[PDB]
Write a protein that binds this ligand. Structure first.
Ligand SMILES: Cc1ncc(C[n+]2csc(CCOP(=O)(O)OP(=O)(O)O)c2C)c(N)n1
Ligand SMILES: [Ca+2]
Ligand SMILES: [Cl-]
Length: 365
């Protein structure tokens, strides 16, 4: 059933942990009270239960990790110095396809729903104006274009240091997230792009210039690739092959810089990424030339939110207490770390294949 481990180490993003807010390291103070709250609730549950109270009390710590490849690789070695971490779901499903059973997924995060995307079960249909993913994109434009983002204020949109709270409905927890496709130009260019989209003219559409993230990203590459393949039926095989033949039509850069590239007019991003991007930042995110606008074209199919995974030999009883400690901390509003990453709630995973793998595979098909 695995070994009881009296020391539990959470892997966290190195870049996040050393985050200096005025030379200070706030996140480090944030994670220590989280850890202190976690230890006390965990050991309370453990000692309250007859099956686990005779095991040693457990101490919790964190360790900084470079990136998610080191997290998954490190966990798969099943070394007690690193026991648990939370990873994007698509990347994890891809890892476990290669090397099945090597690590153990156990909990699912949830995030406050966007006011414009409260229902999971909207999928691509045909990319026309009655397509449910196009309808969500129109709702996003009402929020981001009609009431222009550049003029939002911290008080207007309830900025809390973390996110713009006015674009969220915390009463509804979303089981999922989506990517989205942005388009940018003056009036004539926007119309030309929508025409190429409606005419399913791939070559013209792609030649407007596509900004994308890394090849292994779900929400900045793969989910969009799926929509494009389904909309422009049989016109290219994969975005990587297409790029190979048309390298100047593609650039790896964040969508919020799209306004600064005169040569590019299409960009991939996570849905609603402006919601956690302060419009007053030095980089001037989402800014565009005077007579140009940036707007949403369509969003993607949905995939699960991030997943917490264990090295394989942590005792099963211990795993379940840790899972329930995350859930109760969030309920008691004692989770000071999660909300900073977008994790506003937690759920136990009862069936990985049904709840995570199948949901992801249907979205990229
Ligand atoms: C406060 C806050 N809310 C939400 C986010 C966004 N977010 C957190 S976890 C997650 C899901 C996994 O996304 P990502 O790690 O970018 O993996 P990818 O889609 O690139 O594979 C997202 C979109 C954030 N960075 N900050
Ligand atoms: Ca350990
Ligand atoms: Cl119990």
């Amino acid at each position: 059933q695995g070994q009881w481990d009296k020391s539990i180490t959470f892997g966290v993003s190195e870049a996040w942990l050393n985050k200096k807010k005025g030379g200070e390291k706030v996140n480090k103070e944030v994670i220590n009270t989280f850890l202190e709250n976690f230890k006390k609730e965990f050991n309370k549950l453990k000692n309250a239960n007859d099956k686990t109270k005779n095991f040693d009390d457990v101490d919790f710590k964190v360790t900084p990790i470079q990136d998610f490849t080191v997290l998954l690789n490190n966990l798969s070695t099943d070394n007690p110095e690193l026991d648990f971490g939370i990873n994007a779901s698509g990347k994890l499903v891809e890892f476990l396809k290669n090397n099945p059973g090597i690590i153990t997924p156990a909990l699912e995060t949830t995030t406050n729903s966007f006011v414009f995307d409260k229902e999971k079960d909207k999928f691509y249909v045909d990319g026309t104006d009655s397509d449910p993913l196009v309808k969500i994109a129109k709702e996003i434009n009402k929020i981001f274009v009609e009431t222009p983002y550049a003029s939002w204020t911290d008080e207007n949109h309830k900025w809390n240091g973390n996110v713009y709270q006015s674009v969220y409905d915390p009463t509804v927890q979303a089981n999922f997230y989506r990517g989205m496709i942005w388009i940018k130009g003056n009036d004539e260019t926007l119309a030309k792009i929508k025409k190429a989209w409606n005419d399913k003219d791939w070559n013209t559409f792609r030649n407007f210039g596509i900004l994308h993230g890394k090849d292994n990203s779900s929400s900045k590459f793969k989910l969009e690739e799926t929509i494009l393949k389904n909309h422009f039926q049989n016109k290219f095989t994969t975005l990587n092959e297409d790029r190979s033949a048309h390298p100047n039509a593609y650039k790896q850069k964040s969508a919020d810089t799209l306004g600064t590239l005169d040569d590019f007019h299409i960009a991939f991003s996570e849905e609603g990424s402006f919601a956690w991007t302060h419009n007053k930042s030095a980089t001037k995110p989402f800014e565009t030339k005077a007579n140009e606008k940036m707007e949403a074209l369509i969003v993607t199919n949905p995939i699960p939110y991030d997943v917490g995974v264990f090295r394989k030999s942590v005792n099963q009883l211990e795993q379940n207490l840790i899972v329930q400690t995350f859930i109760n901390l969030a309920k008691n509003k004692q989770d000071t770390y999660g909300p900073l990453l977008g994790y506003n709630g937690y759920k136990k995973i009862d069936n990985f294949q049904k709840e995570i793998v199948e949901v992801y595979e249907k979205a990229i098909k």
